[PDB]
Amino acid sequence: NATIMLPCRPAPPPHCKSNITGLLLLRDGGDTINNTEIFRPSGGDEDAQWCMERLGIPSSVVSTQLLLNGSLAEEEIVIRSKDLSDNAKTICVQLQKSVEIVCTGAGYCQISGRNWSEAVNQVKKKLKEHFPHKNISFQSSSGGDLEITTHSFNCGGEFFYCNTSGLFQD
Amino acid sequence: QVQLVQSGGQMKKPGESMRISCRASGYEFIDCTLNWIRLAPGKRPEWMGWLKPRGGAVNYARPLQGRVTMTRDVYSDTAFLELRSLTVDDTAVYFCTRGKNCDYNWDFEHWGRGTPVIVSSASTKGPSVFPLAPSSGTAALGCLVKDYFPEPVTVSWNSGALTSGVHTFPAVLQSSGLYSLSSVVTVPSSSLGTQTYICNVNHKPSNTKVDKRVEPK
Amino acid sequence: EIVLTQSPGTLSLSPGETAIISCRTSQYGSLAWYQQRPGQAPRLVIYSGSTRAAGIPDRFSGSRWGPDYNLTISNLESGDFGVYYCQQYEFFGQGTKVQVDIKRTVAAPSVFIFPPSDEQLKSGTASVVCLLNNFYPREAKVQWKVDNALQSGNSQESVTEQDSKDSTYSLSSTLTLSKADYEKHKVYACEVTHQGLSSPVTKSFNRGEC
Ligand SMILES: *[C@@H]1O[C@H](CO)[C@@H](O[C@@H]2O[C@H](CO)[C@@H](O[C@@H]3O[C@H](CO)[C@@H](O)[C@H](O)[C@@H]3O)[C@H](O)[C@H]2NC(C)=O)[C@H](O)[C@H]1NC(C)=O
Ligand SMILES: *[C@@H]1O[C@H](CO)[C@@H](O)[C@H](O)[C@H]1NC(C)=O
Ligand SMILES: *[C@@H]1O[C@H](CO)[C@@H](O)[C@H](O)[C@H]1NC(C)=O
Ligand SMILES: *[C@@H]1O[C@H](CO)[C@@H](O)[C@H](O)[C@H]1NC(C)=O
Ligand SMILES: [Cl-]
Ligand SMILES: [Cl-]
Ligand SMILES: [Cl-]
Ligand SMILES: [Cl-]
Ligand SMILES: [Cl-]
Ligand SMILES: [Cl-]
Ligand SMILES: [Cl-]
Ligand SMILES: [Cl-]
Ligand code: NA
Numbered sequence: 001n002a003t004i005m006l007p008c009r010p011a012p013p014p015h016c017k018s019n020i021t022g023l024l025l026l027r028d029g030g031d032t033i034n035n036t037e038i039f040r041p042s043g044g045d046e047d048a049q050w051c052m053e054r055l056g057i058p059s060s061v062v063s064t065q066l067l068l069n070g071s072l073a074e075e076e077i078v079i080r081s082k083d084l085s086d087n088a089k090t091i092c093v094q095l096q097k098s099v100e101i102v103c104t105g106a107g108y109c110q111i112s113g114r115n116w117s118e119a120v121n122q123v124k125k126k127l128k129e130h131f132p133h134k135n136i137s138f139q140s141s142s143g144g145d146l147e148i149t150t151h152s153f154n155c156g157g158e159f160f161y162c163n164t165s166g167l168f169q170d
Numbered sequence: 171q172v173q174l175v176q177s178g179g180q181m182k183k184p185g186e187s188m189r190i191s192c193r194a195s196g197y198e199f200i201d202c203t204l205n206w207i208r209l210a211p212g213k214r215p216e217w218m219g220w221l222k223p224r225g226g227a228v229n230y231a232r233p234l235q236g237r238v239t240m241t242r243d244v245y246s247d248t249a250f251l252e253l254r255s256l257t258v259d260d261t262a263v264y265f266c267t268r269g270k271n272c273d274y275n276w277d278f279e280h281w282g283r284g285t286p287v288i289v290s291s292a293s294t295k296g297p298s299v300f301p302l303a304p305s306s307g308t309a310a311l312g313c314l315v316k317d318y319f320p321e322p323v324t325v326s327w328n329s330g331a332l333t334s335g336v337h338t339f340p341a342v343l344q345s346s347g348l349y350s351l352s353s354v355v356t357v358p359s360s361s362l363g364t365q366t367y368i369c370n371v372n373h374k375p376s377n378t379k380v381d382k383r384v385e386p387k
Numbered sequence: 388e389i390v391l392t393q394s395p396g397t398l399s400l401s402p403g404e405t406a407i408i409s410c411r412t413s414q415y416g417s418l419a420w421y422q423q424r425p426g427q428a429p430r431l432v433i434y435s436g437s438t439r440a441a442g443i444p445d446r447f448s449g450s451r452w453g454p455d456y457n458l459t460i461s462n463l464e465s466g467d468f469g470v471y472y473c474q475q476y477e478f479f480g481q482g483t484k485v486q487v488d489i490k491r492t493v494a495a496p497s498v499f500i501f502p503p504s505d506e507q508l509k510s511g512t513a514s515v516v517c518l519l520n521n522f523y524p525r526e527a528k529v530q531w532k533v534d535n536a537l538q539s540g541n542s543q544e545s546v547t548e549q550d551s552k553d554s555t556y557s558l559s560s561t562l563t564l565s566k567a568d569y570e571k572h573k574v575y576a577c578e579v580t581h582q583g584l585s586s587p588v589t590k591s592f593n594r595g596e597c
Contacts, residue, residue, distance in 0.1 A: 045222050045225060302516055340547070
């Protein structure tokens with residue numbers, strides 16, 4: 001449980017720090033192997049902005065996987081989605097405590113593994129409420145373009161990509 | 171309109187990988203989720219995964235993770251399915267399907283023509299036609315189209331003139347991976363003495379055409 | 388995870404009468420019924436539980452009560468017969484097979500037996516063929532006997548569809564042996580057991596006769 005280094009590709013400058021408010025996930029469909037529900041980071045897909053609007057993320061913030069500069073849900077994690085049992089509709093997780101992502105300007109952006117893993121466990125606990133009696137699991141995206149596969153944000157008018165392999169592998 | 175044109179049927183062998191396509195014409199390609207479903211012989215439809223072309227986000231069914239890979243091509247409105255490390259249990263018909271509304275993906279009104287994939291360790295063979303002799307009311311005789319692969323074959327009698335009392339049974343998959351087929355006909359016994367009968371077999375998948383004369387023993 | 392339980396799997400009906408298929412879903416969701424004509428791509432019949440799909444006869448009507456869903460077909464046309472699957476989200480059901488069965492007077496089969504051609508024997512194998520021909524109803528039993536030795540496993544039945552002309556079924560069981568095994572034994576018999584026959588008819592041939 002130490003600090004995590006995320007190799008963001010286009011060398012994000014050292015002044016790109018943002019406060020993670022929520023996540024965008026997708027539940028794997030089909031018969032559940034070994035009684036485990038898998039969740040992977042999404043870009044939002046059909047109802048992407050819908051989620052961002054409900055989390056108070058401004059129109060200037062366009063990100064994937066990790067939602068930034070939103071408003072945290074008071075009291076507990078809030079799980080939203082046009083439909084949970086529909087694996088085609090993306091899932092919209094709003095955190096109660098943020099996790100700052102700080103970019104060092106050296107080809108990496110850092111996220112404290114202690115605070116991040118604390119959020120991950122809170123999210124898994126809440127997801128275990130809606131999907132009861134099944135081990136909740138996170139994993140990295142199973143396919144798509146590099147905007148969907150990585151945490152893609154923009155800083156200073158430049159679009160960047162951040163390999164979130166370290167964040168979603170439980 | 172809602173038109174989903176798929177590629178032709180392929181024959182693969184255990185271990186090989188397959189790639190099939192599906193071009194979508196008649197609607198905004200990227201606005202609708204596009205799924206791949208396969209129907210196997212006697213097994214309920216199995217959903218393999220879907221793909222949202224705006225962003226290319228794939229969602230593969232948990233069983234198939236690792237083997238399956240779903241891509242797209244927005245320039246040409248073509249969705250691709252790749253399944254790797256095939257087995258005899260992958261013999262099935264694969265479909266790309268789209269929902270009725272692009273707001274709900276699981277009401278598949280629009281289905282592709284279908285692309286069948288046969289996974290057997292048995293290269294193509296042309297049939298051997300053997301005569302089912304009558305051997306002496308009415309008497310019956312026929313042909314046996316045996317040890318051929320893949321389906322299908324066409325059996326006609328007397329170049330299409332004789333069609334009353336004809337039975338072309340369904341083919342059977344033999345333990346050796348090849349198919350067998352019986353086509354018989356019932357005729358007056360006296361006619362059997364004077365009248366002559368031929369069965370014409372055409373196995374197009376191997377360009378094997380045969381005309382067997384069925385003669386009493 | 389949805390547990391769709393569909394019944395009854397097999398349905399034999401004559402054109403016209405009603406056909407009621409049904410599913411039972413664990414979770415609550417919008418359910419659709421699909422039609423697969425044999426040799427064609429599936430067809431969307433019902434969606435959203437009972438909302439009839441596009442261009443589907445008013446004869447197709449779905450009903451829902453709690454977790455149980457029905458599909459009711461009335462006045463079975465010729466093209467309706469096939470296999471019907473119920474879908475909820477990404478999961479389907481076992482399905483049911485809707486077969487056409489024209490009711491008529493119980494006929495009987497015309498059992499004929501064909502030894503293996505001498506050409507086939509020269510090639511190394513041997514395939515004997517029994518032929519239950521033009522009977523009704525479908526259910527018939529072919530037992531292969533060889534020197535009064537019941538044969539199970541070697542045979543391989545294969546049945547044709549309802550003959551549109553006379554509404555009768557035909558069948559051809561193909562028993563296969565190696566030339567060695569064939570040339571070992573003698574009397575090859577095919578025992579038929581259809582209700583149309585008062586007792587089992589045992590058409591047979593002794594090897595080397597005519
Ligand atoms: C789906 O199809 C089935 C088959 O028809 C329906 O189940 C039927 O339910 C009705 C309920 O009204 C039963 O009829 C009743 O049976 C008893 C007889 O003592 C009586 O309480 C009523 O006067 C009436 O006769 C019926 O037994 C039952 N089906 C069969 C074959 O018996 C069902 O309603 C259909 N729709 C659904 C389930 O949504
Ligand atoms: C919003 O995000 C930008 C980077 O995208 C960051 O510089 C800024 O501090 C964030 N605002 C807040 C209130 O955290
Ligand atoms: C946002 O994060 C920055 C640094 O990452 C921090 O200085 C600031 O206090 C945070 N504000 C909120 C509201 O989280
Ligand atoms: C992310 O990084 C890990 C290791 O650093 C690598 O194995 C993985 O392939 C990367 N993913 C992408 C989408 O580049
Ligand atoms: Cl904040
Ligand atoms: Cl990819
Ligand atoms: Cl990377
Ligand atoms: Cl099954
Ligand atoms: Cl097939
Ligand atoms: Cl030949
Ligand atoms: Cl056969
Ligand atoms: Cl017929
Ligand atoms: Na034997």
